[PDB]
Write a protein that binds this ligand. Structure first.
Ligand code: NA
Ligand code: NA
Ligand code: NA
Ligand SMILES: [Zn+2]
Length: 258
């Protein structure tokens, strides 16, 4: 009886195995754009992805994930709310059964069709496992997806999904450039939060970009052909793999822009 997104194992059940699910710094949250305070001292955000080296893509039964070779000082996030340097290790997505839902964060209660999470670890902790345990160990760059015009840089991802349809499948996935997934603006909101999947560790600085990327209906439809199940099991489409907004509790969301 593994955690998932269904009626009997979904987000409302997670707290039994992972009591931190009811903690003080859980993610995602609704971003109240009127309450968020512009912070004129945030340093400029620096997203330096030109030497990123992708390795493999996987269906883990909960999302699809592209892992990067993070053994060297390449693809890094710094500045903004962050102290030091955070190294990209993987990205994955959350998406809906319909275009009107799928994101984890919301903006004034608005749900986007999907959300991209680029996950980075603080290099002061040596690798991602140790970093994942520290209160300032991880930084996730979150990017909303809306349905409209195609995102050309997503197409190479979309086209490999047929090869990882079911849980447990993986494939080599080299030379993917995550710069092709970024919007024009780096305007963002930031707050202290958690992983949005078990174990829900409260170790993430969230940086959520204001500007969504547009992807086509056809691109997101291909996400929805993935399966939660393993090969040979009854087909359950991988859709609505998003955790809803959690209580903000005492937290402040800061804006990088006026
Ligand atoms: Na990792
Ligand atoms: Na853009
Ligand atoms: Na769900
Ligand atoms: Zn995620």
């Amino acid at each position: 009886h593994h955690w998932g997104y269904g009626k009997h194992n979904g987000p409302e059940h997670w707290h039994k195995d992972f009591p931190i699910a009811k903690g003080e710094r859980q993610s995602p949250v609704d971003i109240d754009t009127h309450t968020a305070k512009y912070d004129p001292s945030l340093k400029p955000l620096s997203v330096s992805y030109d030497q990123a080296t992708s390795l493999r893509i996987l269906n883990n039964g909960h999302s699809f994930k592209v892992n990067f070779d993070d053994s060297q000082d390449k693809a890094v996030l710094k500045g903004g709310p962050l102290d030091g340097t955070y190294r990209l290790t993987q990205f994955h997505f959350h998406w809906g059964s319909l275009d009107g839902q799928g994101s984890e964060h919301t903006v004034d209660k608005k749900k986007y069709a999907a959300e991209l999470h680029l996950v980075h670890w603080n290099t002061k902790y040596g690798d991602a496992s140790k970093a994942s345990q520290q209160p300032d160990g991880l930084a996730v760059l979150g990017i909303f997806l809306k349905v409209g015009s195609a995102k050309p840089g997503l197409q190479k991802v979309v086209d490999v999904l047929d090869s990882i349809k079911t849980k447990g499948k993986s494939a080599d996935f080299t030379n993917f450039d995550p710069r092709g997934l970024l919007p024009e603006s780096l305007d963002y909101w930031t707050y202290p939060g958690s992983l949005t999947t078990p174990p829900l560790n409260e170790t993430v600085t969230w940086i959520v970009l204001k500007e969504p990327i547009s992807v086509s209906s056809e691109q997101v439809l291909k996400f929805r052909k993935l399966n939660f199940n393993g090969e040979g099991e009854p087909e359950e489409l991988m859709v609505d793999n998003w955790r809803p907004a959690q209580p903000l509790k005492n937290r402040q969301i800061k804006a990088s822009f006026k």
